[PDB]
Amino acid sequence: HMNDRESLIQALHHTRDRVKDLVCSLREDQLSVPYHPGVNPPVWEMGHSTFFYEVFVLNWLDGTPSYDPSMDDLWDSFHMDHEDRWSKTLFPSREDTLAYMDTIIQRMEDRIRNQPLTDEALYLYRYAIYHQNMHVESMTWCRQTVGYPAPPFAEPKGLTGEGVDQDARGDATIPAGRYLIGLPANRDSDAYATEDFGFDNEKPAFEVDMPEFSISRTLVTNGEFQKFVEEGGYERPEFWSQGGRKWLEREINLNFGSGEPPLMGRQTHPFHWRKRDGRWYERVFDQWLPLEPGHPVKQISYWEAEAFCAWAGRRLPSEYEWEVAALANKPGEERRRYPWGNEMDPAKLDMDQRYMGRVPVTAFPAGESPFGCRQMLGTVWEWTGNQFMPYDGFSVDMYPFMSTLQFATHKTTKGGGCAASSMLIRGTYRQAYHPDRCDVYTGFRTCAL
Ligand SMILES: N[C@@H](Cc1c[nH]c[nH+]1)C(=O)O
Ligand SMILES: [Fe+3]
Ligand code: NA
Structure with a gap:
């Protein structure tokens, strides 16, 4: 450990x-x-x-x-x-x-x-x-x-070998009831340095009367998002929110990262996507690799996800909804920091800067959650609908800027990213990102309306 x-x-x-x-x-x-x-x-x-x-x-x-x-x-x-x-x-x-x-x-x-x-x-x-x-x-x-070369330790091509697509695809209806969210406060535990280690945003722990819901056992794939692009979603101002429509009207250098001269315009697809002779491509550091369909859509904004959820009649989960579907920790029962348990195996998730999110969404079955949701802890920081806000009872850590600079403005993402390391990841973990960001390894799964 x-x-x-x-x-x-x-x-x-x-x-x-x-x-x-x-x-x-x-x-x-x-x-x-x-x-x-x-x-x-x-x-x-x-x-x-x-x-x-x-x-x-x-x-x-x-x-x-x-x-x-x-x-x-x-x-x-x-x-x-x-x-x-x-x-x-x-x-x-x-x-x-x-x-x-x-x-x-x-x-x-x-x-x-x-x-x-x-x-x-x-x-x-x-x-x-x-x-x-x-x-x-x-x-x-x-x-x-x-647009620099990939890091030496990285395998950005991804899990090409275990290219697969099981029938695991589907929503998991989760049992309603009272569930436990977060980690105990450091003053309330003699394991604050061991089994109860977490940052201030994960504390203090609390229980939630959760209504039942259905969450896709699989992340949104490039192909699923393609249809939203092909159907003109970025130009249909109905699936986008107030901030989404403002984010849609941004004029940015759509050629940042590419060694090509600046090209200023509005976003019409995921920033790192580009259609070449009819085929969708994706910049992977210094190379433009083909967009595989079963791979998760990554480096997309909260608004891009929001619009897709509306165009698909689905919804984004809440961060509490997310944690119960990941660890299913219930008050008084034994709890787990990982969807598979409490021991960390770097092999059960796409993290530690290796496959870089180019993994089949239905891969890493060992890291399945109690409810069958796969590749939750890792792959891409999953957008949630809640805004990063302090848990009631918040207490700053010795580093008091860990969370205090990112409240309300940012949205809570959960899971972990291909570029994040596994020693620090937990189901309770909360990572704030501004919903306008397309430069971070963000993705999403959908719940049912
Ligand atoms: N909350 C900070 C934590 C941090 C410090 N340095 C790097 N990360 C952030 O997400 O940016
Ligand atoms: Fe720092
Ligand atoms: Na994830």
């Missing part, structure tokens, strides 16, 4: 190598990426994700000073502003920043090893490693947005 020095130390090394492979694989000319509201300079993410260790572990527990105190405000995500991260005068070189990382990674490992494994240190150990892995995803989707 994640209660072992070994597991932590292995996770720390896996993460550092992920970051290292992400930044060294780039050419010096590529380290300064094209500006985009959702991307960040990769060397900065390496430094920033390393500073978190110094702040919320090394200095937090031992008072250890910073490696270079001069950068203690330039690595901070709250203090530093997005546009000023593309400086090349304020920030050290990829070579010097790599040393900074490797030094702090060693300091981290040394403390994990040569200092007591208090529940406090464990909670902080995991929080920090996870935060770096949250940036492994950011750096990975930066490459997709700016």
Whole structure:
């Protein structure tokens, strides 16, 4: 699991190598990426994700000073502003920043090893490693947005071998009743650092009288979404909401990521789609691969999903509806953090930056939920209808900006993404994304009206 020095130390090394492979694989000319509201300079993410260790572990527990105190405000995500991260005068070189990382990674490992494994240190150990892995995803989707080559550790072609399409397709009517949502608060549990670990957005736990509903056991596929495109949905202003219709009227460079000159216009299909000689294609980092039909529709907005749900007479689930259909945890019963149980097998889901969402929607049957819903935890951040809002009883974490900057404006997505790492995923997990975003690995399944 994640209660072992070994597991932590292995996770720390896996993460550092992920970051290292992400930044060294780039050419010096590529380290300064094209500006985009959702991307960040990769060397900065390496430094920033390393500073978190110094702040919320090394200095937090031992008072250890910073490696270079001069950068203690330039690595901070709250203090530093997005546009000023593309400086090349304020920030050290990829070579010097790599040393900074490797030094702090060693300091981290040394403390994990040569200092007591208090529940406090464990909670902080995991929080920090996870935060770096949250940036492994950011750096990975930066490459997709700016059109850089795929990360070395990735297999973006996807599960081509297990290309399949079982009869699992269908909605699962879920039994009504009282279900348990979320994780216990850290003060109310002596396992806050172990079996009850979660971020502030997942706490405090609560119960819900849930009416029965039917949710598709399968994610919406490229082919299913194709019909909505072919039927002119993006031009039918009826299936789109007020914000959806405003999002439809945006004028954006539809050629961002493509090495082709800027082309300003309105979106008529998923941003990363393009029809070539009648065949639908999809940009996969530096290549335009054919859009396989049984693969999930990915990198689409909440409005694109909203419109599809209306055009299909279906609905988006709520995040509570989602969690009960994923873990089916009921108050007083034994609970599970994963739809398959409480032990994590990286093989039961498309995560850890590998198949990159190009998996048959009806794959990973071992990660099936109690209700038969497949590929819930992972593949693509599934849009929900609820707005990211604090659970009643919210308490900020030691990192108080984990959720407080993304309330109301953002929508709750659940599950996990091809670019997100498996050590941090949980059914209770909540990831906020702005509903206008098409740069993140988002998808959706549909409920029944
Ligand atoms: N809530 C923050 C958490 C985070 C910090 N760094 C990366 N991610 C976010 O989703 O962006
Ligand atoms: Fe961060
Ligand atoms: Na998912």
